[PDB]
Design a protein around this ligand. Structure first.
Ligand SMILES: O=C(O)[C@@H]1CSCN1
Lengths: 275, 281, 267, 279
């Protein structure tokens, strides 16, 4: 029955609308999206999906029950001023804009109506193939049923759980930025395959399949990742020789640096949102 | 396409690979567990206990596995193979398809051993990986001299039920070992580290493990279902000034890409070394 | 129309403009090494900045960033309403120029521009941001003029520091790279002149391929490298030295330094 | 100038380099697309479909390419050149000019194999690169033992239509491979990284790609059209205390120059290794 809105038509809003349509959890005609600059590829992609489109962010608000904000962080204060008068009591405001705090949203929206129902969301692009990783934090006036609605909605396109808002910066550095780390790794792994004689296309396919299978093994396993690493590495063998050169470059610490750098940049954005 | 419901499969070795392939095959429903025999040097393994409860038949006699099976998976260490080939060589019949999974061991080395017993052994060489156990493996195979056309097609249908499977020329399989053969251990290492980073930044350990693994799987599936270069997807998900591009920069400053190239090379080279040392003896 | 200059960037723009036929070289007045060349082109040279302002319609300011305030104080009273003041000085913000000029006349038409030296062969990269009092047609006029000597597009002013780090400093990164590539060719036995020519032609062709392709640079990279071949071996050693991260460091350092100049200009 | 529009051109290999040369030659107008024939062991390549739409005749028989062509480009992998030469050596005629593009394959090795079928094979070795597709390639060539005076001239004319082309001694070509052969890949890596830097500092990706590429194009054009040392051009653009000289310093602190020297060397050394593994 319910309707879903997207303010913004970027990569992430497209990913959610496509993953939601592929889940059949609501008919695409229940979905509206507004961008003042939407590219015709994203227009023709969403329109063929059945996703209703408009340039007027207020049209989305009046159409929608659940309202996704998927725009750049600095654009958010302008959005809230535009649509703030149109926020009804029925609306659930789900922010995806990175580092934008529930406080900064509730402050803006409280100038119009006193109890805005706000949820902060950290999701990632693989929702487009329904394998996203999502966390959400509920705001001051979000009713308990709102969090469940959020949970059921985002569970149709990947993993989803509730966290305290203070962990969302860290989730950003981990699962939010994660897919870009994977894409970088797969491009380098394939370069390695090419270096050793594989055709590029086959190298790309084999590396991506190996990553997926490994991650799936861990998800469906009780065991520590180090234990599964142990089970792959035969004595004297090729895998342990490879693991050694990874260690010599400090491979593990680079991934730690990455999550940390992304979380800290997210906090730097959280401060400008709160300033 | 092909009818192999009444086909018997054997494993020489009952290690991580025999267990992973048998679990995948019986989970795919293309093999009844009681049509699978495995032989192991010792029966005090955790792998044999799980094969027994799976319904797989467990013998200590390699010749018994050979007599029971039509397709014969050789899943032992690379330096054992010429001793297995000696023990069972006379037991090999015309009906047998011998599938070697040892890293490095060449089709011609196996054909040479077996030919001393019977002239036209049907040999296939393959490189698979442990995620066959959840049916998301990556497998390549090459066909030997006396491999029939149906033999490669039969092998590809078998291994496709537990992951991606394609045919390659044999001289690529060492490279493949370094990529998808060792690939899972690189992912496990990467996931352990990513989870340490999540923990450093405040997340509970179990949630950090869960989120990194889900991030890796979804990204891999994204690429497998996309017609786009991995760099384009990197580009697509990196907003200007954002957290992700800042993280990408510190990966680059450590030479993250070169380490993965180093790893694939080291594994492929070690795989070639193991064969050379074997062929010297 | 008429154009004036108030450098190595002043020469480069006048050279490209004339070669494009967009402006008669004599409708151009400027105010060193580049003084012998410019006069040869039939471009009017005058030592008095005030003469340049009185003759010109469009006014490029190509001086050192801490030198603009002194020029503005000097010519400010001579800025009529027909004038468009285009600042190319690195880091000098639109606000700082308008502040100076507005003590003389309330609505100065200011445009801020980040262009680079390859305008001299009409392959520049130019961005520009329109000032508080510039009408729409001032932006379009500027876009038409600088499109004649390379790529040109409008940006928000807060992207110009980033553009400085990418295409503004870019040509020096390429000159450093071609000098090193030529040292490499020389090491492997090529004559120096042949190595310089072949390296620069490789760079040019590669850049033109990317400008004319719909594909990602990584996709074009894949196409060069045959399996097991020479190119992928060379790519590996680039990766092992963190070659990509150095170029990221470069754009970042240039952009940050531009911001620090942008502060000295606003202080 | 030599007249050659009506000659037929053959590619053994319908891969990335055969496509690049065919695309460049047809866009230059020096050959008609229907006068080109290419052969490949694999017809499902994206490049093979691209050649079809151009009007290039595609066959899976290396024999037919030879019989169709006057000039014959060898754009196969290096190690398979020996099997190709045995396969079509009997079909080589006196009218044929054989042009090897394979990295590292020496004129001596080609002439040795081909001399077994008919003496005086006309062989030319060249190293070119993918930007021929936009007619800005970099090509060197060396004439073989039995190449006529005209064959080198005809070869230079053909390849100058798609970029720079000059004659070199054969012992320089391995070095040219590491420089202009692999060159474009170094530039693509550079452009990707520069765009990453632009994005980090806040530019949209597409804008950073365009600006980075345009910066490199115009820098390269400046150098080619000036008589000045790359170092003098670097000096001319680095104002004192400015943003550029700050960025140059971080480049130097990472040994940026040495990485590019390492790259040319590695590619050239690998090019030699490949020929020594053949021999
Ligand atoms: O990597 C390679 O072999 C190709 C052929 S020479 C330069 N690029």
């Amino acid at each position: 029955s319910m309707s879903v809105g997207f303010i913004g038509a970027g990569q992430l809003a497209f990913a959610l609308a496509k993953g939601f349509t592929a889940a059949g959890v609501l008919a695409a005609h229940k979905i509206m999206a507004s961008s003042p600059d939407m590219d015709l590829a994203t227009v023709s992609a969403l329109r063929k999906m059945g996703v209703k489109l408009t340039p007027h962010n207020k049209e989305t608000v009046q159409h929608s029950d659940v309202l996704f904000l998927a725009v750049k962080p600095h654009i958010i204060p302008f959005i809230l001023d535009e649509i703030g008068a149109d926020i009804e009591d029925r609306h659930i405001v789900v922010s995806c804009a990175a580092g934008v705090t529930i406080s900064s949203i509730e402050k803006k929206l409280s100038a119009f109506r006193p109890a805005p129902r706000v949820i902060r969301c950290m999701t990632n692009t693989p929702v487009v193939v329904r394998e996203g990783a999502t966390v959400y934090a509920t705001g001051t006036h979000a009713q308990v049923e709102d969090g469940r609605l959020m949970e059921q909605l985002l569970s149709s396109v990947g993993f989803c759980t509730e966290v305290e808002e203070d962990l969302i910066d860290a989730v950003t550095g981990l699962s939010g930025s994660g897919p870009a780390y994977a894409f970088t790794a797969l491009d380098a792994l394939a370069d390695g395959g090419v270096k050793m004689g594989l055709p590029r296309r086959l190298a790309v396919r084999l590396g991506a399949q190996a990553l997926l299978g490994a991650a799936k093994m861990l998800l469906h396993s009780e065991q520590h990742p180090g234990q599964l690493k142990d089970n792959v590495s035969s004595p004297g063998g090729a895998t342990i020789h490879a693991l050694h050169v990874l260690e010599s470059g400090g491979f593990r610490s680079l991934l730690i640096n990455a999550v940390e750098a992304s979380c800290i940049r997210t906090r730097e954005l959280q401060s400008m949102a709160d300033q």
